[PDB]
Write a protein that binds this ligand. Sequence first.
Ligand SMILES: Cc1cc2nc3c(=O)[nH]c(=O)nc-3n(C[C@H](O)[C@H](O)[C@H](O)COP(=O)(O)OP(=O)(O)OC[C@H]3O[C@@H](n4cnc5c(N)ncnc54)[C@H](O)[C@@H]3O)c2cc1C
Ligand SMILES: O=C(O)CCn1c(=O)oc2cc(OCC3CCC3)c(Cl)cc21
Ligand SMILES: O=C(O)CCn1c(=O)oc2cc(OCC3CCC3)c(Cl)cc21
Ligand SMILES: [Cl-]
Length: 448
Amino acid sequence: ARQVTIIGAGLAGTLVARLLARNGWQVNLFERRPDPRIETGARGRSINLALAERGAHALRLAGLEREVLAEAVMMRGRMVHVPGTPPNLQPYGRDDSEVIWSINRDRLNRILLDGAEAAGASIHFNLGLDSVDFARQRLTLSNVSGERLEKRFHLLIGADGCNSAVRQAMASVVDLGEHLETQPHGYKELQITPEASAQFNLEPNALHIWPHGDYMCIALPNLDRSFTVTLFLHHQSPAAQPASPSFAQLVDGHAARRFFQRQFPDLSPMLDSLEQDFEHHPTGKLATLRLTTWHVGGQAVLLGDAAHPMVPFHGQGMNCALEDAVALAEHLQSAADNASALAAFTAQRQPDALAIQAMALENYVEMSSSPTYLLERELGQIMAQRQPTRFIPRYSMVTFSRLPYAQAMARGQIQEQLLKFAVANHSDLTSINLDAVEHEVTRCLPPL
Ligand SMILES: Cc1cc2nc3c(=O)[nH]c(=O)nc-3n(C[C@H](O)[C@H](O)[C@H](O)COP(=O)(O)OP(=O)(O)OC[C@H]3O[C@@H](n4cnc5c(N)ncnc54)[C@H](O)[C@@H]3O)c2cc1C
Ligand SMILES: O=C(O)CCn1c(=O)oc2cc(OCC3CCC3)c(Cl)cc21
Ligand SMILES: O=C(O)CCn1c(=O)oc2cc(OCC3CCC3)c(Cl)cc21
Ligand SMILES: [Cl-]
């Protein structure tokens, strides 16, 4: 049986462990954290993510989708909250088959852990990867106390997140051609209780947004009607705009409350523990990291966040990580050797990871922010009605299809260009020749 060592029992690592182990591979998975399935007396916060078709299909292939969806909250559309106006629901798709799912991160991780062990993988917790000796095929792990353990490896999979120790080790034997693009927004996680969400009539079957230009809040529902609220806000105020809001200006919980009362007045009354959450929850960091190289011969490979950290504005990081796990398991299972598998995996996934990284950055302005843009959307809907196999909105291609991200981006750009060009020099839909725009759709977009 072929052997593999996986670092990181997160989302991609556990899925790839199950897929390989059920194909008869001898799988050892090492995780720095303790086993979350071991119930303790600790009070762990109910953080969520959005599961879309790419992640759902990966779980479906693994035979875990039904179990994950049993605890997932349907999000039918985007609920935009702007003070003065009642909340407006913008459905994401054509019906309830085109929705996204709010899932508890910890619950998803537990189902994946159970799944990997059921398939025969061995999971070793409280062991963090410190270093790799590629020449000797040995690695060094340690617990929180720094007590070291050395292990031999045959194939190493780095599924160890955005601050990957496997990636750092690879960078000592190969030039990974890394480019780090820091993101100016930090994030803070806050909570809305089930009582508060019900009192203020907050729709449970929607993804909620409080746009505010340079900053915003997003809320995702939980099964118990609580919501996680995430504030995206600059770590520091820029030189050009010193007065502009930032985390640096919010010195304590009381400052955060005054900021919410002024900038998010319909949201602040729903945030009962705002002061405590602000002070006790650390401010998260966001970034985009692009690598030229994801592997070292047939010895080691990166996937998910270890390979391609991205900004979370499209809710596609986990979806991409699960899609990566399927691709990696498929290449490893069927290749002539590990070296061929790793090179083919990298060649297939790298253009798609770059496309989703770019689309995730672009989606911030879509959420956080026009007379011309409403005319564009109206025109885009007519085109989607007239040519349903040619004109598919970019959000739908990314979220509800398994079309390669690079193709979704390329088709999305043609669509965005067509709409922009068509509405330019026109104030309304009645002055636009619909058949001429449709001819450009049939000319530039092959049917899918
Ligand atoms: C604010 C925010 C919101 C997000 N929202 C969404 C969303 O709605 N939808 C979505 O699709 N994605 C979302 N994402 C992205 C998503 O969280 C990640 O892309 C996803 O978790 C990546 O999966 P992974 O397995 O590659 O990494 P991880 O899930 O981070 O797993 C890495 C694992 O490796 C372990 N580890 C780390 N270092 C070591 C080491 N040295 N040795 C051993 N183990 C180690 C970690 O403890 C962890 O268990 C969000 C991310 C952020 C920051
Ligand atoms: O354009 C839209 O209406 C939604 C885009 N999007 C998506 O489909 O899933 C998301 C998940 C997101 O983050 C959720 C986590 C922050 C802590 C929970 C964000 Cl920031 C954006 C998206
Ligand atoms: O009556 C009207 O409103 C204009 C119709 N019209 C036309 O006569 O030629 C067009 C060519 C167009 O696009 C060419 C390239 C931009 C990406 C393909 C468009 Cl989008 C619209 C037209
Ligand atoms: Cl994301």
